[PDB]
Design a protein that fits this description.
The structure is cut from a larger assembly and holds four copies of chain A.
Chain A lengths: L193 E3 L5 E2 L38 E2 L97 E2 L4 E2 L6 E2 L13
Antiparallel strand pairs in A: 1-5, 2-4, 3-6
Protein name (chain C): Large capsid protein
Subcellular location (chain C): Virion
Subunit structure (chain C): Interacts with the mature small capsid protein. Homomultimer; assembles as pentons. Interacts with the movement protein (via C-terminus).
């Protein structure tokens, strides 16, 4: 009947604590294939464009309730059987520029995660589109046109059964969203940026490997005499050389049927892979599993407590190579009992007090990584 | 990522305490006209059939959450201006039979309410489809095909502005739904049934009125040598005569521009309206307002503490009329200052200990009311 | 069905089914002990042993 | 797979508290005995958009 219920239990605001399913409202099969071109995008949609009209538990609020303030969380039930593992990454960054880019050193790095197409059951990644803080209204990425993804780098060298495109489920969670930023006053505890740099196409047999590589950091990365500035790389420089305990995150996007053990550290990228006894620098390493796979790192100042350059010029050298980095060496006699080839990840979430200073008036020459 | 979240915050059951708007999910304009045939249905839809696809605050749960257990509540914002009032009722009963009926002595009586097309701001009526108790899954009225309504009896004798069809809003409320039933062991405190019997088409001028009428009760009601069993009338009998303080609910479905004052009680329906001083029986009465209008009653055993028949036979009499009832007498000199005609409601929610007993082997003759 | 009374377990996958070979999935079903079961009334008879 | 591995069927007994199974006519009841057979679901490879 009569009532100024014009307030009552009607003015619907609710930053919503729906059960992560009383919150669930998505329905899109995450693409999955075999006859595939290395980096294989299993899509890149939108936030609001994504769809219009999706019958689920949290419903009217997508464009109703007003604002909430948790992390737009996901879990995509996948798997396959047992034979080989693989890499995948979901893209989430900012708005867009023009006919842009589509990779793991690109689409992701704003806020990201890293997963395998057959590991036990599923991966997690709680997306909160606003870095600036937290809370959120419908627009902020809509009218700020960002698009997201899902894709390998590595892959299950053993191409399997069919094209299992699983389910992409999200909405949110009541988590304490962390407002990401990076302190100009360079030398600092912790580090944000992320830095994409994994994988390592490893042959079967035991080719006496040690596929070196630096640890130079800066801007972004190449493409056929073409490059790519990102958020883990450029404000993440300005200064010249970089100085701190950052550490990577390797993984077995390869095999529980093919293994290998590869050190990870800081020696000297002026020593070609054929050293007498290469296992000769302050160690850390592989020894993969059907189960085990994701790995990280840790390399500080008891270790290098002295500068190397977050930069380079297309004409920088080895037989005049300054500084130590992670240029790896196997150990074990590589395998497969089949027709395979190994791999190994690389990444930079947060350091142990990083010394940045100085500047680099300029070059580029986006090191082939 | 990985998680047996197959339970987590996902198994979505929730009997929902959405704010009566975080609960709101309806959108249908309640019909309203002028060139109209007395009883004017402004619709009779369904529960689930009602619509399929309605974007609102409580959304997926209509057919998701499983069960809840409050009352499917409504408030329809209406009004007009100032000139004249009127009657309306929403239909809600049980399933259906065949090509059925459509009235205020019909469609409503299962559970009902009573309102005026211009009273201050709005009416209330919290629908809980299950009488048997409470709680509820999607079916119970669906696959039990009930249909609801909205309509006058009286009306604003002054036909106005246009055809204002307002809004019909519901979903539910966290109320203690009362499981309605009626005790066979007849003599009882309180009474459930409802009994439809209002209105009284009153002329302008001051025709020396007293439009009597009984208080006989039984089964349902006529139509051109045709009748109508209902829930306020038949289990609400079986026994013969009925014996208890029940009381009605009158209202000003008429005028704040036309008034009248009409007693309400128990005298003797064997005295034709022209008595010497009709205001001669243990009183209770009208004296309407622009504001005031809805009224009830109260007539017990200090009063009639002796039997009259919840029944009759088409050949029952006055010049041999047994028992006392509410057969009314005006008082005041009827008005309008225009072109109008008065009215007066009648209803039976709950008594003061009702004595039913005996039975009636049968007749009918559904008293023209 | 297009007059089907009541709710039951009529399942929906989720994930993109696999094998990396030549396979095909499956899923069991059984009733040892309930949580307080309401049986009453009777059924004077039919049969028509539902294809399960 | 491999061949036709017919394993070994071993029994005799155990000192367990054998539970005397029955089912109460007075229908509405806590717990339930009967067992009811109704599993399996022949599921194709690929990802035929199932929900059997």
């Amino acid at each position: 009947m009569e009532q100024n219920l014009f307030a009552l239990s009607l003015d619907d605001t609710s930053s919503v604590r729906g059960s992560l399913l009383d919150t669930k409202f998505a329905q899109t099969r995450v693409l999955l294939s075999k006859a595939m071109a290395g980096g294989d995008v299993l899509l890149d949609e939108y936030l609001y464009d994504v769809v219009n009209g999706q019958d689920f538990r949290a419903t009217v609020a997508f464009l109703r309730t007003h604002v909430i303030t948790g992390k737009i969380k996901v879990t995509a039930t996948t798997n396959i059987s047992d034979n080989s593992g693989c890499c995948l990454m979901l893209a989430i960054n900012s708005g867009v520029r023009g006919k842009y880019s589509t990779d793991v050193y690109t689409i992701c790095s704003q806020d990201s995660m890293t997963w395998n197409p057959g590991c036990k059951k599923n991966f997690s990644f709680t997306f909160n589109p606003n870095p600036c803080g937290d809370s959120w209204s419908a627009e902020m990425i809509s009218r700020s046109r960002v698009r997201m993804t899902v894709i390998c780098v590595s892959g299950w060298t053993l191409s399997p059964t069919t094209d299992v495109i699983a389910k992409l489920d999200w909405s949110i969670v009541n988590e304490k969203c962390e407002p990401t930023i990076y302190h100009l006053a360079d030398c600092q505890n912790w580090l944000p940026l992320n830095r994409w740099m994994g994988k390592l196409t490893f042959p079967q047999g035991v080719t006496s490997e040690v596929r070196r590589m630096p640890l130079s950091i800066g801007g972004g990365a190449g493409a056929t005499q073409a490059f790519l500035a990102n958020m883990p790389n450029s404000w993440i420089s300005m200064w010249r050389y970089f100085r701190g305990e950052l550490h990577f995150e390797v993984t077995k996007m390869s095999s529980p049927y093919i293994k290998a053990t590869v050190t990870f550290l800081i020696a000297f990228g002026n020593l070609s892979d054929a050293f007498g006894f290469y296992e000769s620098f302050p160690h850390r390493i592989v020894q993969f599993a059907e189960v085990e796979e994701k790995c990280t790192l840790v390399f500080s100042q008891q270790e290098f407590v002295t500068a190397w350059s977050t930069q380079v010029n297309p004409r920088t050298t080895l037989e005049a190579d300054g500084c130590p980095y992670l240029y790896a060496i196997i150990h074990d006699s590589t395998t497969g009992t089949i027709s395979g080839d190994f791999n190994l990840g690389v990444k930079l979430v947060g350091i142990k007090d990083f010394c940045g200073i100085g500047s680099n008036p300029g070059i580029d020459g986006s090191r082939l990584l």
